[PDB]
Amino acid sequence: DNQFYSVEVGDSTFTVLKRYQNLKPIGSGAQGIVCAAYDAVLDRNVAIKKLSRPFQNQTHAKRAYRELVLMKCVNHKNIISLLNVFTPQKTLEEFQDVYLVMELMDANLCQVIQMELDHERMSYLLYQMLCGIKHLHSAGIIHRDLKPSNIVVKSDCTLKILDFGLASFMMTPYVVTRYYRAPEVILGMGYKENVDIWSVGCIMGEMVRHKILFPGRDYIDQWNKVIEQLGTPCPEFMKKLQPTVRNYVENRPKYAGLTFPKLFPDSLFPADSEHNKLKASQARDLLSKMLVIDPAKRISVDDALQHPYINVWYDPAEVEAPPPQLDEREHTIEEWKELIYKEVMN
């Protein structure tokens, strides 16, 4: 008789529509807790994400509102699409949580990165990330925070990006992962679409090396790892930095940088047959063109899709699609609560 029922999944209580049965924990990040469930109405398995009090603070509220609005806009096989959105609370006064429902995937890209992948699967996963980023860019969305935990895949190698990136203080224990951010984000520099190509390079490099390329406690250690491996950037890049940051960057020790065959040796690639030897040199070539500090010299998404390691998956039906407003204002808890509540109640 009650439209909703509640079940305990670890430390989180999930109050969901009775169509969703056999809820089980699968993962969790920071914005919310996630469960697998059987949807008895659609006769299919789904993933349910709980957003607890999204209006509680500016950081939570801006992301919750933006991702609800943008999700209804974008329509791409490599970008998340919601099956349902609901709240168990009946009024704005009582409104507390938002539940988002999507197709159930099998793993996040962090799990995939740990496995040895042949060139067929590695290049197909990179092709799909580039198709998804291309669709985001066509909709006027430049991501800037693409990372493995926000990318999901199924057993058949299909892939979907879960979030829309950057729009600051948080009193929670969870710290954000900054290892995939481009130099232009690390150094507050101004950016174009190919800021996301740096993140694809970091992901690709980690798939090969099975270790994060540019780790660090904060941007200080992270920038050191970038220059130690790729080398000190050109003076043309140095002239585009803001004066205070430019002084910091030009006063670090000078690094020549390691060659891409040295950063990614043949030992890390399946290099047995002539077919695989060519694919490994093509994979290194693409890494060489994405992991470029200066965005004026870094490869674009469209040119990355045309790279010989990627273009073996090209097809006009999914590379291109028909494109389609613009929100970014500060609000009180009450105003954010009503903006998110109105979006949940279409």
Ligand SMILES: Cc1sc(C(=O)NC2COC2)cc1-n1cc(NC(=O)Nc2c(F)cccc2Cl)cn1
């Ligand atoms: C990372 C893993 S692991 C795994 C698994 O164990 N599958 C086996 C097969 O039966 C159990 C499934 C997934 N998976 C995660 C999502 N979605 C979100 O993380 N967020 C998310 C959401 F849920 C709902 C809406 C929005 C967002 Cl953004 C989808 N699939």
